[PDB]
Symmetry: C4
Subunit: 116 residues, 4 copies
């Protein structure tokens, strides 16, 4: 099976703090253990705005740590993620919240469905 075709992450938020050259961010980590390249449609849902959809690809037997703070998503704006792939993959979302006086990480494997 090598994963699932749909992944969901309800708690999305790009903090705006930084420390030196290290900036707060979220990384949507995706892995493809299959033999086919994965085309993934990433839908971002907001609290009072319409959805925004991005697209990425990940080659066979490769990892991809996608920096969500580089997609034009407004910083400090709550959102949720729905990712749909044409082939099974596995995803995990991690957040780094840093500032002059703080530095913390949090992570979770996502909720999955479709060819689990």
């Amino acid at each position: 099976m090598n994963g699932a075709r749909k992944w969901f992450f309800p708690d999305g938020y790009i903090p705006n703090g930084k420390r030196g050259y290290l900036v707060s961010h979220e990384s949507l980590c995706i892995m493809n253990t299959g033999d086919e390249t994965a085309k993934i449609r990433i839908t971002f849902l907001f609290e009072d705005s319409k959805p925004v959809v991005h697209e990425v690809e990940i080659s066979p037997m490769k990892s991809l740590h996608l920096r969500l703070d580089k997609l034009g998503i407004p910083k400090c704006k709550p959102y949720s993620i729905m990712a749909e792939s044409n082939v099974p993959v596995v995803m995990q979302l991690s957040r780094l919240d840093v500032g002059k006086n703080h530095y913390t990480l949090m992570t979770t494997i996502g909720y999955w469905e479709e060819g689990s």
Copy 2:
């Protein structure tokens, strides 16, 4: 057709009382609804030696909702657990921000799900 589950569970609930400037410790129950109908969600809070308390919230179609649990009248520094039941499938994640004059940390997890 639809994505998610109707029931979500989060055993580790706790609202810290620490404050850091204008920032206050809290927990955010993040919910996403990828469906076409508004989700009506009943959130039940279970305690260790007190009876349950139930709240209600709604999330519009294709929207995200980061619910601040520290704004519901739940006693601070009181362990609890959460059972959330929706009329339509949704996805949930619970995150906690514990902050104080000398600390700042985050933790999160996708919840356990049922019926979806």
Copy 3:
């Protein structure tokens, strides 16, 4: 229809030894019972080079229980894993607070479940 699963697993267990003020480093095995019957839970601790240690707890209907694992006689700073078995479906989450004079951090995860997906 009951909610939860009868078996829960948490591979990363560890009780840190630091403290700060009123707080001490610890792990909290949080369990919830949304059913109509009391849950009798057998908690097994597995170690890397030692034999298992088993504890027992009970949780009444529609109640929460945040079990402090640092108060069970488990050696501090000794890696372990947890297998929990309940007579009725429940839901569990494990969280760790690692604190000291110069650090304070939390981590958590819903556990892996079996028999009641």
Copy 4:
């Protein structure tokens, strides 16, 4: 049998910071509640490099907190993990990111498949 034969962790990364005896690392925690020793093949996937595979064993009714920073994996290089066992097991991945001025933990149970 308790557990699953395949486990996946998309967000792998070994930080390079240290603080005294403390060294940043990731611990792949595995538990075997079965009666037979588990032979586990751990595959590491990278963003622009080929996979690297390691092997470990875990005795019956034992825990194993595997230090991933002791396997020759380049530090500060994103990767993902796929672990395959001949018998059912359960896995969790935790990261300690520590330095002169920070100390933080994050963790998640992994995505699983081929499990009872």
